Design a protein around this ligand. Structure first.
Ligand SMILES: CC(C)n1nc(C#Cc2cccnc2)c2c(N)ncnc21
Length: 822
C-alpha cells in the first residue's frame, strides 16, 4: 500500500517522488523526514478529535463578517420533512429542538447531539449564533429562498471522522575566487557581484575584469569584499550577474553564505544561472535546474580555517515622536540611540528600528536582537509588514510568525494568497512560515484545500517546483483521505483540458452548433462522465459538483474558448444547480488577486455596517495558464442587454432605456425598487473598487448584471493603471440610479454618499492594502513589479492626507467623472 500512496502523491503534485531522491541533497532529505513527522503527528491528533471538533476541522463555519423566516428540515435517513417558522434571532439548537419534537409526534416518540447540514453541501450550522449570522441563512433572506436543512446525528459525523483515517574571530575582508563559466553570446563579458541582506547592500558591488565574449570563460580572480567576515549576518546573500558590454544582461544567480546548518560555506561551487529579463537580490537562492542548457559559473569560497553562526545565548550575551509616524541620517541615529525607549514605549515601531540597524556590523545586530528577544508581540497588521523582504533576518521572521499565530482562520484565509507568495522569499526549505502554513492547513481542511491549489498551480515554474513539491508531499502525508479527494479534482481537470483542446480544434473547422454537439458526445463517454461527476469544487470545497448536465454545457466563443460546465444535484435542489468555467490559455493570477481584494473591501465595508451588495465569485488558478471561474447564474452582460433586441420584454424606444426595461422585466411591480437599490449599491462598490485598484478598460462587455439588480465585473487583466485611470461614471448606470428620470438628485446624491462612505472606509485600512500588495511583489505578476505600482495605491487612497482633504480630492474626481458622463 505504501507504494500505492507514493504514486498517488506523485500524480497529484505533478512531480515524481523519485526526482526528490535523485537530487541526493541533505537539506531536501531533512526537510522531507522532519515534515513527514510533523504532518503525521497532526493527522494523529485529528483522528481522536471530538465530533464537534471534527466538524470544526472539516466544515468550518461560514459566518457573516426580531423577524421570522420559513425553513425546511429533515433527518438524514428519511424523505418526509417539515417546514417550520422561526426567527432570524433563534439559535440552531432552538431549531433542532423543533425538528426533534416534530419527529417525536409523527414517529410516535436531545438537541445537543446534532448538527444541521445545508442540503447538498459540505456546510453546517452549529454553535451559539443567531441564524442570520450564518452566511447561508443570510443569502437565503436576500435572494428570498427557504433554507433547506438536514439533521445530522453525532454518530454519523463520527463515522465520517473514522473513514478518513490515514565566527567573531575572522577579521580579514570576505572574498571569493571567480574561476570560469560556460555561456552563449555576442563584445566583452563582465561579472558583477554584490552582498545583500534583503534590499540593502552590505557594502559596494565589486566587479570583474572584462574578458572577450569567447568561451566557456576563465577568470581565476580573488574578488575581495568591503566588510569583515565576522560581520556577515546569519542571512547574508551573495549575488552574481553576468552580462556583456562594448548593455546586455544575460544571467544572474544568488546563494546564501551560510548553509541551512548555520555553517559558513567553502570551498568551490558551480552556479547554474537563470537567464536575464543587472543584480537580483530577491531572486531565488537556488540554482537553475535545467543544468543541460543553463550557463554556469564556478566560484570558490575560501575555507577560513567548521564555523557556525554562534548560538542565541552567545548572541544574548553580547523630536522622536514627531518623525515617528524614509528618514535622514541623524534621524536614524536618534532612533537607534533610543532603541530601548522604542521597545518600551513604541513597540509598534519595530520595523522602523530594524530598517535603521546596521546589518553590516555584528555588534549592532547583536544589540538589536537582544531587544527583539523581549519585544512584546505585535498586532496582526504589523506582523504582515515584517514578512516583507526588507526583513530577511530569521529571528525577525520568527517573531513575525509568532505575532501571526493569533490570526483567525477567516483572516488566515483572507491573506493566504500573500503568505504563499512569501514562501518565494524564503532562503531555506525548512522554515517557520512553512511549518506554520502546514500546521494551520492540517488543522483546517478549507485552508488545506486552498494551500494545495496555490501550490499545485505553480508546479510548472522551475524556480518554485521543488519547494512547493515538497510542501504538497508533506501535506499528503498528513491527510491520506484529502489527498484522494484532491486527486478526484485533478482527474476532472485533466479531462476538462482534453475536452477544451478538442473544442479549440473543432471550432476552427466547423460551426458552433456542430462543435457543441461533438463536445456533448465526448462528454458522454463513460470515462468523462465518471471523471467530471461527483467532486468537491476546486473553487469552494463546500460546493459539491454532483452530476454534470451535458445538455447544458457549452463553450464561450472568445479566443481561448472557455468551457461552460453545469452541474445539478437532487439532494441539494436549486442550490445544487451550479456552474464552473474552465479556461486554458490565459494567466488567471491577476483576476484572482483583483477578486480577492474586492472581497476584502466587501469585508471591511460590512464590518462598519455597509453592504454594497457585491458578488464575490470564485476564481482559482490550477495549473499552467489554467484555472476555473465560478459561474454567476441568472446574469447577462450590459452589452448583451444593450443589443436592444426585438421580441423581448425589454424592447425600448430609446437605447438608454434598455437596461432599465430589462430590470423591470425581471422585477415586476413592487420588486422594481429593491432592484434599483441593489444596482445602486453595487454600482458604488464597483466604481470605488475599480478606481482604487486602477482597473481600466471597463466597458459593456466585461460588466454584468444579475436579475436581482446587482452589477459586477468580469475579465480584469489590467490594474494599478497599467494600460492614472479616472473615476468612471457611466451614463447608462446613472440613468438606472435616477430611476429613468433626467433629473433626480435625491437618488443620485444618495449614490454619491455610498461611494464616499466606501472610499473613506478603505482609507482607514490603507495600510492593510499596502502591506498586502507589498508581499504580492513576490509573485512576479507583470503589473506588480516595482515601487511605482505600490505608489499607484498610495495615490488612489490619498493616504498622505487628512480625511477632510482626501474627500475633497475624491469629490473633484467624482465630479469630473459625472461631467465626462455624456
Ligand atoms: C455570460 C458570460 C459573459 N460570462 N462570463 C463569465 C466570466 C468570466 C471570467 C472571469 C475571469 C476571467 N475570465 C473570464 C461569467 C461568469 N463568471 N458568470 C456568468 N456568466 C459569465
Amino acid at each position: 500500500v505504501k507504494k500505492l500512496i507514493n504514486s498517488q502523491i506523485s500524480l497529484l503534485i505533478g512531480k515524481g517522488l523519485h526526482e526528490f531522491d535523485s537530487l541526493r541533497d541533505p537539506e531536501v532529505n531533512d526537510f522531507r523526514t522532519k515534515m513527514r513527522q510533523f504532518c503525521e503527528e497532526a493527522a494523529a491528533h485529528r483522528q481522536q478529535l471530538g465530533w464537534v471538533e471534527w466538524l470544526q476541522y472539516s466544515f468550518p463555519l461560514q459566518l457573516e463578517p426580531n423577524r421570522a423566516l420559513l425553513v425546511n428540515v429533515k433527518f438524514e435517513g428519511s424523505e418526509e420533512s417539515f417546514t417550520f417558522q422561526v426567527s432570524t434571532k433563534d439559535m440552531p439548537l432552538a431549531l433542532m429542538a423543533c425538528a426533534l419534537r416534530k419527529k417525536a409526534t409523527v414517529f410516535r416518540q436531545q438537541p445537543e447531539e446534532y448538527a444541521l447540514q445545508v442540503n447538498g453541501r459540505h456546510e453546517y450550522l452549529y454553535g451559539n449564533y443567531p441564524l442570520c449570522h450564518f452566511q447561508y441563512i443570510c443569502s437565503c433572506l436576500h435572494s428570498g429562498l427557504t433554507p433547506h436543512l438536514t439533521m445530522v446525528h453525532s454518530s454519523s459525523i463520527l463515522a465520517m471522522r473514522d473513514e478518513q483515517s490515514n565566527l567573531w574571530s575572522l577579521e580579514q575582508p570576505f572574498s571569493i575566487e571567480l574561476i570560469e563559466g560556460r555561456k552563449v553570446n555576442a563584445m566583452k563579458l563582465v561579472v558583477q557581484a554584490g552582498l545583500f541582506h534583503g534590499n540593502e547592500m552590505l557594502c559596494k558591488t565589486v566587479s570583474s575584469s572584462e574578458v572577450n565574449v569567447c568561451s566557456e570563460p576563465v577568470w581565476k580572480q580573488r574578488l575581495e569584499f568591503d566588510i569583515s567576515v565576522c560581520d556577515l549576518p546569519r542571512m547574508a546573500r551573495l549575488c552574481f550577474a553576468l552580462y556583456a558590454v562594448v548593455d546586455c544582461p544575460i544571467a544572474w544567480a544568488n546563494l546564501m553564505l551560510f548553509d541551512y546548518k548555520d555553517q559558513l560555506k567553502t570551498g568551490e561551487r558551480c552556479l547554474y544561472m537563470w537567464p536575464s529579463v543587472l543584480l537580483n537580490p530577491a531572486g531565488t537562492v537556488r540554482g537553475n535546474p535545467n543544468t543541460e542548457s543553463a550557463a554556469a559559473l564556478v566560484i570558490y569560497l575560501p575555507e577560513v580555517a567548521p564555523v557556525y553562526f554562534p548560538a542565541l545565548e552567545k548572541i544574548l550575551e553580547l523630536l522622536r515622536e514627531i518623525l515617528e509616524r524614509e528618514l535622514y541620517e541623524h534621524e536614524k541615529d536618534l532612533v537607534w540611540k533610543m532603541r530601548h525607549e522604542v521597545q518600551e514605549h513604541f513597540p509598534e515601531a519595530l520595523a522602523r528600528l530594524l530598517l535603521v540597524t546596521k546589518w553590516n556590523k555584528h555588534e549592532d545586530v547583536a544589540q538589536m536582537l537582544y531587544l527583539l528577544c523581549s519585544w512584546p508581540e505585535l498586532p496582526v497588521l504589523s506582523a504582515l509588514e515584517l514578512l516583507d523582504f526588507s526583513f530577511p533576518d530569521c529571528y525577525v521572521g520568527s517573531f513575525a510568525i509568532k505575532s501571526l499565530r493569533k490570526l483567525t482562520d477567516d483572516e488566515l484565509f483572507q491573506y493566504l494568497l500573500q503568505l504563499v507568495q512569501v514562501l518565494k522569499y524564503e532562503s531555506y526549505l525548512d522554515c517557520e512560515l512553512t511549518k506554520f502554513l502546514l500546521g494551520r492547513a492540517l488543522a483546517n481542511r478549507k485552508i488545506g484545500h486552498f494551500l494545495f491549489w496555490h501550490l499545485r498551480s505553480e508546479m510548472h515554474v522551475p524556480s518554485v517546483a521543488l519547494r512547493f513539491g515538497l510542501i504538497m508531499e508533506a501535506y499528503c502525508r498528513g491527510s491520506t483521505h484529502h489527498m484522494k479527494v484532491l486527486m478526484k479534482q485533478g482527474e476532472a481537470l485533466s479531462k476538462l483540458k482534453a475536452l477544451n483542446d478538442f473544442v479549440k480544434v473543432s471550432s476552427q473547422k466547423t460551426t458552433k452548433p456542430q462543435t457543441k454537439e461533438m463536445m456533448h458526445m465526448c462528454m458522454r463517454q463513460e470515462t468523462y462522465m465518471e471523471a467530471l461527476s461527483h467532486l468537491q469544487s476546486p473553487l469552494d470545497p463546500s460546493t459539491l459538483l454532483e452530476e454534470v448536465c451535458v445538455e447544458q454545457c457549452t463553450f464561450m466563443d472568445s479566443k481561448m474558448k472557455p468551457l461552460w460546465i453545469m452541474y445539478s444535484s437532487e439532494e441539494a435542489g436549486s442550490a445544487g444547480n451550479v456552474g464552473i468555467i474552465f479556461k486554458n490559455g490565459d494567466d488567471l493570477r491577476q483576476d484572482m488577486l483583483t477578486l480577492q481584494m474586492i472581497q476584502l473591501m466587501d469585508v471591511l465595508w460590512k464590518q462598519e455596517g455597509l453592504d454594497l451588495r457585491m458578488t464575490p465569485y470564485g476564481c482559482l488558478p490550477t495549473g499552467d495558464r489554467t484555472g476555473l471561474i465560478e459561474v454567476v447564474l441568472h446574469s447577462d452582460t450590459i452589452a448583451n442587454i444593450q443589443l436592444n433586441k426585438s421580441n423581448m420584454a425589454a424592447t425600448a424606444a430609446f437605447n438608454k432605456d434598455a437596461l432599465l426595461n430589462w430590470l423591470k422585466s425581471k422585477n415586476p411591480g413592487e420588486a422594481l425598487d429593491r432592484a434599483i437599490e441593489e444596482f445602486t449599491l453595487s454600482c458604488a462598490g464597483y466604481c470605488v473598487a475599480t478606481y482604487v485598484l486602477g482597473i481600466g478598460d471597463r466597458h459593456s462587455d466585461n460588466i454584468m448584471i444579475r436579475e436581482s439588480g446587482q452589477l459586477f465585473h468580469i475579465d480584469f487583466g489590467h490594474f494599478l493603471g497599467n494600460f492614472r485611470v479616472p473615476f468612471i461614471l457611466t451614463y447608462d448606470f446613472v440613468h438606472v440610479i435616477q430611476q429613468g428620470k433626467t433629473n433626480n438628485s435625491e437618488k443620485f446624491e444618495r449614490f454619491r454618499g455610498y461611494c464616499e462612505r466606501a472610499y473613506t472606509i478603505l482609507r482607514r485600512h490603507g495600510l492593510l492594502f499596502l502591506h498586502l500588495f507589498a508581499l504580492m511583489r513576490a509573485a512576479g505578476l507583470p503589473e506588480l513589479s516595482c515601487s511605482k505600482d505600490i505608489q499607484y495605491l498610495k495615490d488612489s487612497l490619498a493616504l498622505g492626507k487628512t480625511e477632510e482633504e482626501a474627500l475633497k480630492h475624491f469629490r473633484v474626481k467624482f465630479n469630473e467623472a459625472l461631467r465626462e458622463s455624456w
